[PDB]
Amino acid sequence: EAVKTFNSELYSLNDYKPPISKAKMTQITKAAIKAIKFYKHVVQSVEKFIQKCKPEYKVPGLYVIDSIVRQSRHQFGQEKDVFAPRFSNNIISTFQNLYRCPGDDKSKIVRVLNLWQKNNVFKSEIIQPLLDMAAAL
Ligand SMILES: [N+]
Ligand SMILES: [N+]
Ligand SMILES: [N+]
Ligand SMILES: [N+]
Ligand SMILES: [N+]
Ligand SMILES: [N+]
Known part of the structure; x- marks a missing residue:
């Protein structure tokens, strides 16, 4: 139900041409x-x-x-956020999938990783292999 609503909004991305609207991203995040x-x-x-x-x-x-x-980090606190730790479990595989994007989109991924590193969203032991994967392409 709460998951049904989230899935609905997430899969609605398919109705749109990127870049995605801020309002749409906000709706997915809030859900x-x-x-x-x-x-x-x-x-x-x-x-x-x-x-x-x-x-x-x-x-x-x-x-x-x-x-x-x-x-989630803003709203619940960096130490209490449940989302980044849970995303970390499969993150290497997630990024393997992400890097199969158009070559003109690769820089956008590295930008996100750079910001995650600066803000310590993940520790170096997670961020560094993800950075290494960009370089190896
Ligand atoms: N999908
Ligand atoms: N939390
Ligand atoms: N959280
Ligand atoms: N992930
Ligand atoms: N992409
Ligand atoms: N980021």
């Missing part, structure tokens, strides 16, 4: 956060979206992760 009880379902849905989506939607999918983790 994720309202559904914090079901954070595992939320993370699983985002990961599935990114695995299966067309190449033009990989960066939008990453922005969904970025938007959820930023809002």
Whole structure:
């Protein structure tokens, strides 16, 4: 139900040509956060979206992760945020999927990683392999 509403908004990305509207991203993020009880379902849905989506939607999918983790850290506290730790479990595979984006979108991913590193959204042991994966392409 809370997960149904989130899935609905997430998959609605398919109706749009990137870049995605701020208002749409906000709606997806707010739905994720309202559904914090079901954070595992939320993370699983985002990961599935990114695995299966067309190449033009990989960066939008990453922005969904970025938007959820930023809002959750702001709203619940960096130490208490449940989203970044849960996304970390499969993150190497998530990014393997993300890097199968158009070559003109690769820089957008590295930008996100650079900001995550600066703000310590993940520790170096997670961020560095993700940075290494960009360089290896
Ligand atoms: N998808
Ligand atoms: N993309
Ligand atoms: N939290
Ligand atoms: N959280
Ligand atoms: N992930
Ligand atoms: N970021």
